[PDB]
Design a protein around this ligand. Sequence first.
Ligand SMILES: [Zn+2]
Ligand SMILES: [Zn+2]
Lengths: 155, 463, 145, 48
Amino acid sequence: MESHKHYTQSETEFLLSCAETDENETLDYEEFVKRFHEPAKDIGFNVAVLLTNLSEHMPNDTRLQTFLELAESVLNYFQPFLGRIEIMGSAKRIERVYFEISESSRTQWEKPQVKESKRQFIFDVVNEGGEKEKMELFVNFCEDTIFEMQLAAQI
Amino acid sequence: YQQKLLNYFARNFYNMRMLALFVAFAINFILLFYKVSTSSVVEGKSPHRIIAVHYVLEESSGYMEPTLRILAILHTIISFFCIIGYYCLKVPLVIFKREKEVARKLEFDGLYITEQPSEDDIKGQWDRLVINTQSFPNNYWDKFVKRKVMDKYGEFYGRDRISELLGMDKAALDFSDAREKKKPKKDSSLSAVLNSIDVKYQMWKLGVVFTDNSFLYLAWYMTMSVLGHYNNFFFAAHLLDIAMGFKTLRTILSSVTHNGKQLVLTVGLLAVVVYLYTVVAFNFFRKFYNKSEDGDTPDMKCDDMLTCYMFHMYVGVRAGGGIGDEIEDPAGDEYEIYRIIFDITFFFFVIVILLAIIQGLIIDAFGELRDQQEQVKEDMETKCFICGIGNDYFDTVPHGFETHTLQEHNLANYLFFLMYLINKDETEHTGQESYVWKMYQERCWEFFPAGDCFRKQYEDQLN
Amino acid sequence: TMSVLGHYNNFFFAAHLLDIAMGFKTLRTILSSVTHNGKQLVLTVGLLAVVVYLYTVVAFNFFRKFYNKSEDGDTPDMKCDDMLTCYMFHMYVGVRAGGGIGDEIEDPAGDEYEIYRIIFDITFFFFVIVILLAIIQGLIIDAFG
Amino acid sequence: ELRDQQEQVKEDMETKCFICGIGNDYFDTVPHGFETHTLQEHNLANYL
Ligand SMILES: [Zn+2]
Ligand SMILES: [Zn+2]
């Protein structure tokens, strides 16, 4: 442990205190799965989503900036997975939506085969055109691409 | 083991395609060292068949013939692997598209309920065969289409007809006593019985994949590869794969393909014009067409119609100067002036004008493709793809348009939200997720922002 | 290197004439039209080579007897009864003919393969002489534009 | 020139209304505003 965790009892020796799987002076990687594998992501992602939503909807507030600068680390970690879209809400107002993006989904969309299809799809709706079919063509492209990645998961 | 082999063959499809291209090039390079024997072979003497066709006499080597044999066998094997990889990888996308189209046609338009399409749309007619099968939503991952069509069309058209058409004939699916709960499955490893397969769906899928054009091309590749063993010169037909194996080469050939519809019409006009010139020549200038050598020979001439037409189409277009280069000169004849206008008009209309159109269509195709790419680039740089507000409004804040395109409205984010909605159980949908999911089910697309955005509605300072 | 080789042989000073290409802005503008699509010009030449190769394959298999370039018959018959010889024959004479390969072969005067040879010559002329050179001459114009 | 003429007429039709010539920017404030204006309010078939 030399990279990031500093040498204090609250930081470094806390890990050794938690690591008590066996008394044979040995440790296994099963602790990694047992603790902070599922729950780390499961609660930290919701906490980050709450903080991002509050920061976005509460601008020009001094109190929230302290929480932002303290949770900078977890927000930087959760930036790749956190997503933002905008929809027409049920109250006829524009509302933002936050959800979770899996790592395999972000990996497959970066592959050249998928990126080539995106370039060709944009080349078609611009030339052929559309006034109401445009959103229909966009969703049709999305569903066809989603099948490609889910099939690509079966390597 | 079979599943792992199929996955391996599906992963490296383009790799085996390019490797087949390379081995085809190698075989064709080997083919450049052929020869034909001579010296009055055992066949008796102008012999009927003393051909002694071919041999592969090398330049101080003896490795070429076994190399050709093993490369032919290897090419056939690799191409079979290419077919297997295509069926493993790209067929499911086609089947998914077809299933999606027919499912939405049934659920929204009633193609086989209230429409009954006519003799046209043969693909749509063939799509009627998959309606009554058991495993209809095999790839569309929407298994509720058969149940949900009843709530829309059952009352107005009768339960019995739709139930018979779709194929789940049962009164109320109500079990009586344990409904044959569970037992050991007859199917197992080492091919125990393996009979739970829908022959109807398999035949429909086979028809779709046997009508697919890329699969047709791969089947032709198969036929040429296996014919290459019957005659090794048939391996030359595999050189055409470079046209569809390279993006730059596809770009080059798209210039011809763009106006190939009009090139053939131009050639037809050339044929018609040459025919009219042959009519005039046959009627009037028949005596000039004496191609016999030095006069005192049996006079071969085009004193016919088909002969004269083939003469004009063969020599007269390929002359660079028209037909006047290949006819006797009009040295002091009563038709000298008329023949002069004949030759000059033929040259100026066939050689100069029509070939100019043929060579100008390609240039216009190049220009049109370049302009199309410029237009799509300018559209992407000018307006947002989702709301189409325009960069002028967003650029008030520094990098406003880039922020809007990257964070607020993003194609990747809108694509990932669909996967998130699909792979989540309806019990765990929040209010917004359910509101979007319902409108996705009913295909409204009104939740996509249009003419509005978060900044447009709520300014950063509340307005 | 060329300047010092010019003392060994004074004809090597001719290689220094190419400096005009990079010494003049207008001349650079002229040559940039070719340079813009030089990546695709070589691919077009490669397509020409492949098409000529296919035509040589067909000619070697079927129309071998027509390729007798020997003079006035009663001479030692020089002909392209090979593969590399026929391919070099087609690439040398047949592209530089203005009318395809039919200008340099014996005419099909009353033969069973007359129609097939006619389609052979016409297709060769219409695909090699007319279409490919049109692409070569259109790439430059597109570069200018 | 013929291709450019066809492109110009297509762009003019896609940009401005044939009757009033207001422009799609004003109408597109409401969703599908220009399409509504071209189909319902100002229509060549209706005026014929
Ligand atoms: Zn936008
Ligand atoms: Zn109007």
